[PDB]
Scaffold this active site. Structure first.
Site, PDB file in Angstrom:
ATOM      1  N   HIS A  78     -83.214 -95.185 -12.787  1.00 34.57           N
ATOM      2  CA  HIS A  78     -82.997 -96.640 -12.037  1.00 34.57           C
ATOM      3  C   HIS A  78     -81.532 -97.241 -12.880  1.00 34.57           C
ATOM      4  O   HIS A  78     -80.981 -98.090 -12.153  1.00 34.57           O
ATOM      5  CB  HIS A  78     -84.120 -97.482 -12.399  1.00 34.57           C
ATOM      6  CG  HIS A  78     -85.490 -96.929 -11.783  1.00 34.57           C
ATOM      7  ND1 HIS A  78     -85.437 -96.689 -10.474  1.00 34.57           N
ATOM      8  CD2 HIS A  78     -86.616 -96.680 -12.384  1.00 34.57           C
ATOM      9  CE1 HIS A  78     -86.694 -96.335 -10.313  1.00 34.57           C
ATOM     10  NE2 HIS A  78     -87.470 -96.101 -11.449  1.00 34.57           N
ATOM     11  N   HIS A 114     -79.822-102.385 -21.094  1.00 35.27           N
ATOM     12  CA  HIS A 114     -79.318-101.862 -20.038  1.00 35.27           C
ATOM     13  C   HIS A 114     -78.394-102.440 -19.155  1.00 35.27           C
ATOM     14  O   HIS A 114     -78.299-103.861 -19.228  1.00 35.27           O
ATOM     15  CB  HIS A 114     -80.711-101.191 -19.079  1.00 35.27           C
ATOM     16  CG  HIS A 114     -81.345-102.425 -18.563  1.00 35.27           C
ATOM     17  ND1 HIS A 114     -82.307-102.807 -19.268  1.00 35.27           N
ATOM     18  CD2 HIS A 114     -81.030-102.935 -17.492  1.00 35.27           C
ATOM     19  CE1 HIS A 114     -82.932-104.015 -18.607  1.00 35.27           C
ATOM     20  NE2 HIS A 114     -82.243-104.282 -17.442  1.00 35.27           N
ATOM     21  N   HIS A 135     -76.990-103.309 -14.822  1.00 38.09           N
ATOM     22  CA  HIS A 135     -77.131-103.060 -13.350  1.00 38.09           C
ATOM     23  C   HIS A 135     -75.538-103.068 -12.870  1.00 38.09           C
ATOM     24  O   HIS A 135     -74.730-104.124 -13.404  1.00 38.09           O
ATOM     25  CB  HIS A 135     -77.448-104.189 -12.773  1.00 38.09           C
ATOM     26  CG  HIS A 135     -79.147-104.398 -13.095  1.00 38.09           C
ATOM     27  ND1 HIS A 135     -80.256-103.709 -12.556  1.00 38.09           N
ATOM     28  CD2 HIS A 135     -79.544-104.791 -14.521  1.00 38.09           C
ATOM     29  CE1 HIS A 135     -81.316-104.046 -13.407  1.00 38.09           C
ATOM     30  NE2 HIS A 135     -81.118-104.528 -14.556  1.00 38.09           N
ATOM     31  N   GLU A 147     -76.694-109.017 -11.011  1.00 36.85           N
ATOM     32  CA  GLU A 147     -78.072-109.344 -10.340  1.00 36.85           C
ATOM     33  C   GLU A 147     -77.877-111.192 -10.328  1.00 36.85           C
ATOM     34  O   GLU A 147     -78.276-111.450  -9.073  1.00 36.85           O
ATOM     35  CB  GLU A 147     -79.073-109.000 -11.342  1.00 36.85           C
ATOM     36  CG  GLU A 147     -78.988-107.457 -11.371  1.00 36.85           C
ATOM     37  CD  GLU A 147     -80.752-106.982 -11.477  1.00 36.85           C
ATOM     38  OE1 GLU A 147     -81.261-107.191 -12.635  1.00 36.85           O
ATOM     39  OE2 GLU A 147     -81.195-106.294 -10.659  1.00 36.85           O
ATOM     40  N   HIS A 197     -78.366-106.593 -19.693  1.00 36.31           N
ATOM     41  CA  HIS A 197     -79.549-107.044 -20.088  1.00 36.31           C
ATOM     42  C   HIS A 197     -80.114-106.598 -21.422  1.00 36.31           C
ATOM     43  O   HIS A 197     -80.410-105.452 -21.614  1.00 36.31           O
ATOM     44  CB  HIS A 197     -80.597-106.888 -18.898  1.00 36.31           C
ATOM     45  CG  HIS A 197     -80.466-107.502 -17.760  1.00 36.31           C
ATOM     46  ND1 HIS A 197     -80.974-107.172 -16.473  1.00 36.31           N
ATOM     47  CD2 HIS A 197     -79.604-108.503 -17.333  1.00 36.31           C
ATOM     48  CE1 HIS A 197     -80.605-107.977 -15.294  1.00 36.31           C
ATOM     49  NE2 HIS A 197     -79.536-108.674 -15.995  1.00 36.31           N
ATOM     50  N   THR A 250     -86.656-108.040 -13.005  1.00 32.40           N
ATOM     51  CA  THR A 250     -85.775-107.749 -12.010  1.00 32.40           C
ATOM     52  C   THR A 250     -86.056-106.400 -11.299  1.00 32.40           C
ATOM     53  O   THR A 250     -85.271-106.211 -10.030  1.00 32.40           O
ATOM     54  CB  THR A 250     -84.245-108.053 -12.048  1.00 32.40           C
ATOM     55  OG1 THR A 250     -83.913-106.883 -12.822  1.00 32.40           O
ATOM     56  CG2 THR A 250     -83.925-109.343 -12.615  1.00 32.40           C
ATOM     57  N   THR A 251     -87.057-105.557 -11.579  1.00 36.09           N
ATOM     58  CA  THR A 251     -87.294-104.513 -11.373  1.00 36.09           C
ATOM     59  C   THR A 251     -88.688-104.475 -11.150  1.00 36.09           C
ATOM     60  O   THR A 251     -89.416-105.107 -11.993  1.00 36.09           O
ATOM     61  CB  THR A 251     -87.032-103.264 -11.798  1.00 36.09           C
ATOM     62  OG1 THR A 251     -87.612-103.000 -13.132  1.00 36.09           O
ATOM     63  CG2 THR A 251     -85.350-103.042 -12.346  1.00 36.09           C
TER      64      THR A 251
HETATM   65  N1  LIG Z   1     -83.993-105.974 -15.487  1.00 28.60           N
HETATM   66  S1  LIG Z   1     -84.802-106.612 -16.417  1.00 28.60           S
HETATM   67  O1  LIG Z   1     -85.652-107.649 -15.840  1.00 28.60           O
HETATM   68  O2  LIG Z   1     -84.140-106.808 -17.780  1.00 28.60           O
HETATM   69  C1  LIG Z   1     -86.228-105.516 -16.943  1.00 28.60           C
HETATM   70  C2  LIG Z   1     -86.576-105.398 -18.314  1.00 28.60           C
HETATM   71  C3  LIG Z   1     -87.529-104.191 -18.516  1.00 28.60           C
HETATM   72  C4  LIG Z   1     -88.379-103.453 -17.522  1.00 28.60           C
HETATM   73  C5  LIG Z   1     -89.242-102.585 -17.974  1.00 28.60           C
HETATM   74  C6  LIG Z   1     -90.407-102.589 -17.275  1.00 28.60           C
HETATM   75  C7  LIG Z   1     -91.615-101.629 -17.560  1.00 28.60           C
HETATM   76  O3  LIG Z   1     -91.756-101.465 -18.649  1.00 28.60           O
HETATM   77  O4  LIG Z   1     -92.443-101.298 -16.602  1.00 28.60           O
HETATM   78  C8  LIG Z   1     -87.808-103.883 -16.570  1.00 28.60           C
HETATM   79  C9  LIG Z   1     -86.740-104.690 -15.644  1.00 28.60           C
HETATM   80 ZN   LIG Z   2     -82.238-105.314 -16.123  1.00 29.35          ZN
END
Ligand SMILES: NS(=O)(=O)c1ccc(CCC(=O)O)cc1
Ligand SMILES: [Zn+2]
Ligand SMILES: NS(=O)(=O)c1ccc(CCC(=O)O)cc1
EC number: 4.2.1.1
Length: 259
Positions: free
Chosen positions: A63, A93, A95, A105, A118, A197-198
Site C-alpha cells: 500500500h 510513510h 502517500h 490526502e 504521515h 486514511t486506509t
Molecule cells: N494513513 S494513516 O492514517 O496515517 C495510517 C496509519 C496507520 C495505519 C495502520 C493500520 C493497521 O495497523 O492496520 C493505517 C493508516
Molecule cells: Zn498515511
C-alpha cells in the site's frame, strides 16, 4: 482476507463494503478550508522530540512503504498542541501521485500536493498500538505536505533504499535514520479529530497537519513512483495514487495554531 487497494475495482469507493466506518462521522482526510479554520489560543506549544529516535527497518506493505521505529521506550515522541499526554512514534510513510498535481490526502483550499508524509504516533497511556486503536484519542498523526522543487537532503537515504524494496512484502534494514530531516522550518499547523486514511479506517486519530510543505525534487518523487503494489514475480502495478480523497467534514471544526 483484506483485498482493498487503490484500483478502480478495490479503491476508496469500495472500502465501505468491508469497512462500514468508511461512511462514519470522523473520517479522514478532509479538505482544510483555511478561511473557516479558526485560530485557537487554547492550543499549547507543539513539541516534536525526535532526538533519540531509533529507526529499524523499511517495509513495502503493498500500500505504501513504512519506515519503522523502536517504540519500546519513549525514544521519539510528540506532545503539546492539541494533545493530552505523550504520543510515541511508531512509523512514518507517504502517500503520493502518478503526477505532481495530485498525491496528498489532505487538501488545502482544494489544492492537492504531490505527496503527503504521515508520522504515526500512539498514546502511551494505552500501552501499545493495538490498544490505542480502540480509543478515540489513541493516535496522533503528524501530516506534512510535499511539493516538487528543490531536493530534500534528508529524504535521499529513503529514496536510495527503495530499489531494494520494490515489491510487496520486501523489507530492508534502515537503522540510524533521522526523521527530523523531513520536517519544514515552521511547526504552524491545523488540527482536527479524524481517522486512519486506509482500512480499517478506525476513528482514533488526532490529525496535526503542518501548514508549511517541504520541497522534494522531481527525481526524488519519481523514485517513489517506481515502487510496486504487486509482489515479486507478479505483473507490475506501479505504486502510485495511493491516496484517499477528502471525506465529509460533518460535525467538525478545524483549528489553527497560528493567527
Ligand atoms: N494513513 S494513516 O492514517 O496515517 C495510517 C496509519 C496507520 C495505519 C495502520 C493500520 C493497521 O495497523 O492496520 C493505517 C493508516
Ligand atoms: Zn498515511
Ligand atoms: N471493500 S474492499 O475491502 O475495498 C474490497 C473491494 C474489492 C474486493 C474484491 C477482491 C478480490 O477479488 O479478492 C474485496 C474487498
Amino acid at each position: 482476507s483484506h483485498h482493498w487497494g487503490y484500483g478502480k475495482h478495490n479503491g476508496p469507493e469500495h472500502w465501505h463494503k468491508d469497512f462500514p466506518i468508511a461512511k462514519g462521522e470522523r473520517q479522514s482526510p478532509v479538505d482544510i478550508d483555511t478561511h473557516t479554520a479558526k485560530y485557537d489560543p487554547s492550543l499549547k506549544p507543539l513539541s516534536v522530540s525526535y532526538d533519540q529516535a531509533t529507526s529499524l527497518r523499511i517495509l513495502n506493505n503493498g500500500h505504501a512503504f513504512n519506515v519503522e521505529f523502536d517504540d519500546s521506550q519513549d525514544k521519539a515522541v510528540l506532545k503539546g498542541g492539541p494533545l493530552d499526554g505523550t504520543y510515541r512514534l511508531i512509523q512514518f510513510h507517504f502517500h503520493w501521485g502518478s503526477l505532481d498535481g495530485q498525491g496528498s490526502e489532505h487538501t488545502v483550499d482544494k489544492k492537492k500536493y504531490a505527496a503527503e508524509l504521515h508520522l504515526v504516533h500512539w498514546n502511551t497511556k494505552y500501552g501499545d498500538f493495538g490498544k490505542a486503536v480502540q480509543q478515540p484519542d489513541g493516535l496522533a498523526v503528524l501530516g506534512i505536505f510535499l511539493k516538487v522543487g528543490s531536493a530534500k537532503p534528508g529524504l535521499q537515504k529513503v529514496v536510495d533504499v527503495l530499489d531494494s524494496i520494490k515489491t510487496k512484502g520486501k523489507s530492508a534494514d534502515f537503522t540510524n535514520f533521522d526523521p527530523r530531516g523531513l520536517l519544514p522550518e515552521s511547526l504552524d499547523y491545523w488540527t482536527y479529530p479524524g481517522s486512519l486514511t486506509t482500512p480499517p479506517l478506525l476513528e482514533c486519530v488526532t490529525w496535526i497537519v503542518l501548514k508549511e510543505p517541504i520541497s522534494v525534487s522531481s527525481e526524488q518523487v519519481l523514485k517513489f513512483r517506481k515502487l510496486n503494489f504487486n509482489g515479486e514475480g507478479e505483473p507490475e502495478e506501479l505504486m502510485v495514487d495511493n491516496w484517499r480523497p477528502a471525506q465529509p467534514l460533518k460535525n467538525r471544526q478545524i483549528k489553527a495554531s497560528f493567527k
